[PDB]
Structures are given as C-alpha cells and as structure tokens.
Design a protein around this ligand. Structure first.
Ligand SMILES: Cc1cc2nc3c(=O)[nH]c(=O)nc-3n(C[C@H](O)[C@H](O)[C@H](O)COP(=O)(O)OP(=O)(O)OC[C@H]3O[C@@H](n4cnc5c(N)ncnc54)[C@H](O)[C@@H]3O)c2cc1C
Ligand SMILES: Cc1cc2nc3c(=O)[nH]c(=O)nc-3n(C[C@H](O)[C@H](O)[C@H](O)COP(=O)(O)OP(=O)(O)OC[C@H]3O[C@@H](n4cnc5c(N)ncnc54)[C@H](O)[C@@H]3O)c2cc1C
Lengths: 445, 444
C-alpha cells in the first residue's frame, strides 16, 4: 500500500504523525511520501521575506508576517498529546510569538521522527485517478534536480492549505492610485508603514491583527472599512472606521457615506480561495471558506472518490487538534479500520451537517459546532480525548477580552486544559514588546 | 479538420493568429484555431496591471510592466512590416512611445484582422500532453469565468507564453532581517512609492537601468546600482551611485564587496527571469538560460524532440515584434505543410551551427546583427514582407550611441521608419519632464 501526502504543513505533519503513531503501537503502516514545495516543513508557520513568487517560480505560500503572535490563547491550540509544560519545562504567557509557537510545533514533530518521509523543494504539479488500476498518478517537479517525475499511489491526502491563494477584489481607480496596494498575504513588516496612513479593506482572518501591528509599530493612521457585521471594539484614537470603499484616485479613498481621506497604502484583507491547480474537476474541492464544505464525508473524505482525502479545509476556529482528529480518522479509513458508507449515505450525512451549519448565528454556536465535529472524529479513533467544552469556554473568554479592549487582549492569562496550569503574565505588555524573538520571549525584564 | 492550440495572446500569440489570418485573406484553407489567454485582455506584458504576485484568479501575475514605461528602443525597430505606424495613428509620432501607445498599436493590428474570435480569455493552460497512440495533443485548461477545468484535442501546439514573467529572485544574507521593502523588478509598479527614498537596484538584467531612471525621474532621493557584471558605461545623475556586488544587509543598511556600507529604504532585485512552463512535462519543456540562441529549437521555433510543438519569442530580445512575426509565419507554413522539416539529426545540426556562431558573439553590435540575420533567414522562407534589416541594425547602432551620450535623454531622439520612411517628429515634451504617461497626453 502506497500513500501520497501533499504538503508538510501542520495538516501533512499531522497525517505523518497519525501513521507513525499507529506503527509505534505495532501495526504495519503503508509507505508514506509527503511532497513539500518549500525547503522545509511548517507550512504557514515557515516565515519568509519573499512575496509573490518563490525562488523556483512557485507561489510564495506563507502569509505570516513579522511580529506576529498567537492569534488566540495558546491553551486553545495546545496539542492533545504534547503539552506546553512538556516542551518548555517552564510556564509561559498565553500568546507566544510565532517563533516560540514554531519551536513548540517542531518539537513534537521531530520527537516523532517523521521527517524521513518528506521530499522538500518538490511541487505537486498534477494528481490523476486511473480508472483501470484504481490507482493515482501524482506528477511532481523536483526543484533541486529540476526534473519532473511521476509515481503511482493507492491513496492521496491533500494537505496544501486554503489560506495562501488571495482573493483580491478590484476597486474603481486602483490603476491610478499613487500608493502601494497589497493583499494581506503579501504583508511582511509593519515598519514599512511607520508614519503612514493605511487603509485596511475587509474583515477576513488577518484584518484586525494586521491593523494592530501597523498601529503598534508607529503607523500614522489606520482606516478600516468592511462589509460584515460591525464588531463593537474600542479602537485607538488614530484608528478610524468608515463605511465600505467605493473608489480611489491618485491619493484618496472615497467611502460609501461620501467622505474621503488621504491614504498612503491599501492592504486588502479580503480573504483566500480554495485553489488546487494540480487537480482536475473529478477530484477538486470547490467551496467558499466555511465551517462545513460539501463533498467531504466526515469533513475529510472526497465523496466522488473515497481514495482521496482533504485535511484542514474547513474554516479554522480550532486548528492543530482538528487536523490531528481528521488525520487519525483518515488513517483508520485508509488502513481498513473503518469502512465507509455508500456515496448516497455519505452525501446525505454531509447534508445533515450542512443543515446544522446554516443554523449557526453566534460565535459560541460556531465553536460548539466545530468542537462537536472534532469530538465525532475523535470518538472513532484512538486519538486522546481533550476538554473541548472547556476549550470552547476559553475561546469565548478570548472573544470577551477582545470586546473589552482590542489592544490589550494579548496580556490576559488562561488555564491550560491539558495540565491545569494557569499561564503567568508576560514580562512585557504586548504594545511595548517590539522584539519578535524566541530568545527575548523566553528570558526576563 | 486540423486544429491548433495557441498558448498566450501577447505579441507572439497575436502574431501567430495574424499569420494564419493573412494566409486566409490570401485565399488559403486555414486549420481551426484556438488561443488560450489567462488574462482578461490581449497584449501580454503590454497589458498593464496594478496587481502583483497573484492575479484575481490566483494565477501568477504575468506583466512586469510598470507605470510610466516608455519603449526601450526606437519604435522604428519594432514596427510591423504589414501594419504601419502611419496606418495606425494616421500621423507621425515620436520614436519612443509610452506603453499604452504601443499597446494601442499592437492590438490595432489584430482588431483589424478580426482574430479576437479565436481567443479564450480568462483561461489558464494547466497541462499539455502528447499522445503517442494518437499523434495528437491533449490541452487541459482552467476557465476562470465558468470555474471549470476541461481538455481538448489538438494536432499542433504553439507556445507563446513568454519568458519574462517568472522571476529569478536570489537571497542575500540578512534579507529576513531587513526593515524595508524587498521586491523583484517583476513586482515594480509605481516609481512614486519611492519618492524621497534611497533605492538599491541589485543586478544588471533587462530593467535595471530603466527602473532606476523611473525612480530618478519621479523623485527618488538616491539610487544605488550594484552588480557583479562589467561596468555599464553610463554616466548617471549626481544622486546615483554604482557599487560592486551586494554581500549582506542588516535592519537598515546594505553592505558591498568593496567594504562599503549605506542606509537603504528599498531593495529592487533586477536579476532577471527563468523560462518556466509549469504546464509541460520534460518531453516538451524548453529548458534554457536567457540568450540569443536557446538549444533544442529548429530555426529557433520548432521543438526538435517533437516537431508538432512550437515556441515563439523564446530567445532574448534585441528585435521584438518583427521577430515574433517572422517566427509566427515560419511556424504557420510548417503547420500548413508549405515547408517540410528535415530529419531530427539534420535539425539538431542546423541548430548546432547557429549555436556555435552565437558563442563567437563578442559585442552588442554583433549580437543584434546576429538576431537580424536569424530573422532574415526566417523571412527568406515565407511571404512575410521583407524589410531592410541592415538599416534596422544601423538604427540600433544609432540608439546605442545615443544612450552612451546621455542615458537620460536617449528617448528625446527621432528616427526614420524603415517601413514608410516617416521621420519621427520631436515630441512636445522632453522625457525627464513628461510625467504624464497617457496615450491622450502623448498624442496631444
Ligand atoms: C496570517 C496567519 C496567521 C495564523 N495564525 C494562527 C495562529 O496563531 N494559531 C493557529 O492555530 N493557526 C493560525 N493560522 C492558521 C493556519 O492555517 C494553521 O495554523 C495551519 O498552518 C494550517 O496548516 P495546513 O497544513 O492545513 O496548511 P499550511 O500551513 O498552509 O500548509 C500547507 C502546505 O502545503 C504546501 N503546498 C501547497 N501547495 C503545494 C504543492 N502543490 N506542492 C507541494 N506543496 C504544496 C505548502 O508549502 C505548505 O507547506 C494562521 C494563518 C494565517 C494565514
Ligand atoms: C519590463 C519589460 C519591458 C519591456 N520593454 C520592451 C520594450 O520597450 N520594447 C520591446 O520591443 N520589448 C520590450 N519588452 C520585451 C517583451 O518581452 C516583448 O515586447 C513582448 O511582450 C513579448 O511578447 P510575447 O507574446 O512573446 O510574451 P508576453 O508579452 O509576455 O505574453 C505571453 C502571454 O502568455 C500568457 N500566458 C502565460 N502563461 C499562460 C498560461 N499558463 N495559460 C494561459 N496564458 C498564459 C500571458 O498572460 C501573456 O499574455 C519588455 C519586457 C519587459 C518584461
């Protein structure tokens, strides 16, 4: 049995780990080949100065930027099989910088010894299902040797992400704007916008955080405009909210009310698309970003072809723990431990899940929904169970601290749901901690 | 019937369509034509976009053209032999028109030809496979309008997807730490973003000098050109320094191979491009550095391992539009059985001879004269209007001289059309002062 894993981000790392964990217990695991286009694993977490296209002409993958910290409480991502105490030995504050979180992430994955399965600097060019042999043709470009080769596989797990191919809407006047226009995906360094007025369009994943990085690092003025429901956050004195953008000229933005302001740069925080150029329509997932995409049994299995799998393709309220559950589930399906219903029943099961999804209004409902999804997957495998209700509860006190004050939510502390450890206060308040580094974070004063 | 896939509708793809249309106008039986273009409109590089990185559909942005771009060489060197500047603009214009004017020109030709009807816009080529059992090509494509992936069968394929879009972007020590903007020439859009800033231009590829000129003209505080290559020869303005290669950067500063250090606000990597065809496997895929004579191409056009596959405009460009034409006419007549191909071994041999001659090229004059001879060879074989290549070369000579005189005024010079003999009038505004790059201001 021969399996292909597209991508060495957290999802592909989870899949590898799922298989190593089955084997470490004593089962005989299929051969694993994980193709990764970057020079090293980590996916989104592997930060790069590069933007647009990479050294090989491949789309730059990572959207992460300098000075980024944990989006939510670290206790909400803490791995179900590997604790923050286990890895660091010391208690730490609740919103670690990217570097810190990365060290934690690789700590688990290298203790697992799964690196041996990965082909780096190798981009999946095509995946094709052979009707006659019930096998897959995966065509790959190796950028080290510069050769395009293909090899056959029995199962394929797609772990290539959905936060890398930008949705970039055009607004009337864009060709003439004398300032810089970039998608959030291209944002690297908040110092570039020091003393400048930045217009921030949209309300997708990084809109609120990108703004607050610019603010913290000395932007002159921020303007947020968006089309979704206004979160009543108290913004700082030089942060302005306007109705949606309609047009721009050489140096000005014009909003729906009829007001205008001088704008030095425009960051489109307008989201991403599910994009799989290596896929034909018989295998290609088409969906907007949501809690419940169609055509995926248990949110993981490609319904038109049970031999193909997708990890991490849902909108991510939960992240790392969800990828694990999804991976473990997919592993047990591939290995023959869990038999799949018929296409008809899979489709109908997914419909019940969609119908549930359409019902959700509040943030609490949305976590509970995703928590229940993960609980469902965990129940079917030997994945260790974790305190989902209390994790939901923690997510919700994070949303609460955001509402109280959007600029200081990162100085709050939370109780670990793996070890019960209350996180200590960080030595430096967020606003003042300009230093991005692990070495800064781990030390004192 | 016979059907042909044309990949890309830049100058080259437009030209191929024009080649077939002209044969039909002369009364020939034309194969069925299908042209795939990932952008919304034709023009290739010349279709300007504000976008960088990835386009509205998640496809890599193709154009590397920036605001305020004017023709690098005299327009007299790129005039179509069958579609004249006089015919198009109805009147004499200066010799270095801005982008939109040249964009207006090139589409003016194919609008008249009525070839828009063969083109499928907003459609990205995903894969091309040759089928041995069928002697035919499967072209898999993504229509971003319908959001569907399909595949059609073709007897011949002509690849016109360009080779100046996928950048080569080297790392220098400290790039992760650098506090300012780092971009490739490919991403460069508007010189204004650099008003009052110190800009480092790394390398000496095609656009190094011109990007620096834009920044200078639109008010950059200081420019620094650094490169490993031999000195360019140009005396720059007062606020522009040359340096040997970059070595490393810190938070604010760049460090050079001569022990020098300078604070820089932005680094522009002018390091060129790679030939990149993610839709081809090793059997069909041209692999080469940018040069006057790539290998594996008979007459610079015919893929030798599969003579049913063709490439237009894949060589480095002294000539541009005339060349794509000669190439498009040549590939037309091969497709239409008008020019049978010699053996594979014989094809490799003609290629070697053109390669060995290329290795002997030792001056700029020799290089464009070489390309001129290559074009003359292609044109001798077809009904493409012959035009005075030797006189075109002398126009290149005159242009290189003008650059050597004063690099900031070379665009203020006029030249005689080798097609109509029209003498380009002096433009109403010197380049340094013509801040407005529009077609309306230009033709006023
Ligand atoms: C700005 C930003 C901040 C975030 N912050 C947090 C946070 O604080 N906490 C949190 O829990 N989550 C955060 N996330 C969510 C993030 O999506 C997940 O943490 C996680 O990275 C998802 O992992 P993934 O493997 O599914 O996708 P990715 O991490 O994106 O990895 C996909 C991998 O597939 C590879 N790949 C793609 N195409 C190909 C190809 N054709 N061939 C070969 N390889 C390919 C890529 O190189 C990449 O390594 C953030 C996301 C963004 C964009
Ligand atoms: C910055 C810059 C400045 C230049 N200035 C001049 C100048 O002043 N004078 C001059 O004579 N020449 C200039 N050139 C040279 C230029 O290469 C030619 O003028 C000309 O544009 C080449 O035409 P082409 O059709 O061969 O390639 P392109 O113009 O690049 O067109 C290729 C086409 O293929 C399409 N395409 C690519 N891949 C796919 C795919 N996968 N699926 C569907 N479609 C695809 C693209 O969208 C594009 O339309 C310049 C080039 C650059 C980069």
């Amino acid at each position: 049995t021969r399996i292909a894993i597209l991508g060495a981000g957290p999802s592909g790392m989870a899949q590898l780990r799922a298989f190593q964990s089955a084997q470490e217990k004593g089962a005989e695991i299929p051969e694993l080949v994980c193709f990764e286009k970057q020079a090293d694993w980590g996916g989104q977490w592997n930060y790069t100065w590069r933007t647009g296209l990479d050294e090989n002409g491949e789309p730059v993958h990572s959207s992460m930027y300098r000075y980024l910290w944990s989006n939510g409480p670290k206790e909400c991502l803490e791995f179900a099989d590997y604790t923050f105490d286990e890895h660091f030995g010391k208690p730490i504050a609740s919103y670690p910088p990217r570097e810190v979180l990365w060290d934690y992430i690789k700590g688990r994955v290298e203790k697992a010894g799964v690196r041996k399965y990965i082909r780096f600097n190798t981009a999946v060019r095509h995946v094709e299902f052979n009707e006659d042999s019930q096998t897959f043709t995966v065509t790959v470009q190796d950028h080290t040797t510069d050769t395009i080769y293909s090899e056959e596989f029995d199962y394929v797990v797609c772990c290539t992400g959905h936060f890398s191919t930008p949705y970039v809407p055009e607004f009337e006047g864009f060709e003439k704007f004398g300032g810089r226009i970039l998608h959030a995906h291209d944002f690297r360094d908040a110092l570039e916008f020091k003393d400048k007025t930045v217009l921030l369009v949209g309300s997708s994943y990084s809109a609120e955080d990108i703004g607050s990085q610019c603010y913290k690092y000395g932007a002159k003025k921020l303007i947020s405009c968006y089309r979704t429901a206004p979160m009543g956050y108290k913004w700082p004195e030089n942060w302005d909210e306007r109705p949606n953008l309609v047009r721009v000229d050489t140096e000005n933005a014009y909003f729906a009310d009829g007001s205008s302001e001088k704008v030095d740069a425009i960051i489109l925080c307008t989201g991403y698309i599910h994009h799989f150029p290596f896929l034909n329509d018989d295998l290609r997932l088409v969906t907007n970003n949501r809690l419940w995409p169609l055509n995926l049994y248990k949110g993981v299995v490609w319904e038109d072809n049970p031999k193909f799998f997708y990890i991490g393709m849902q909108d991510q309220w939960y992240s790392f723990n969800m990828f694990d559950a999804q991976a473990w589930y997919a592993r047990d399906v591939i290995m023959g431990r869990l038999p799949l219903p018929s296409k008809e029943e899979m489709k109908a099961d997914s419909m019940a899940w969609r119908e549930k999804e359409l019902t959700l209004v509040t943030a609490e409902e949305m976590y509970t929904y995703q928590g229940d999804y993960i609980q469902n997957l965990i129940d079917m495998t030997d994945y260790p169970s974790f305190d989902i209700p209390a994790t939901n509860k923690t997510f919700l006190e994070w949303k609460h601290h955001k509402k109280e004050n959007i600029m200081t939510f990162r100085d709050h502390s939370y109780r670990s749901l793996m070890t019960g450890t209350m996180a200590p206060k960080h030595h430096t308040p967020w606003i003042d901690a300009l230093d991005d580094s692990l070495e800064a974070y781990l030390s004192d004063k």
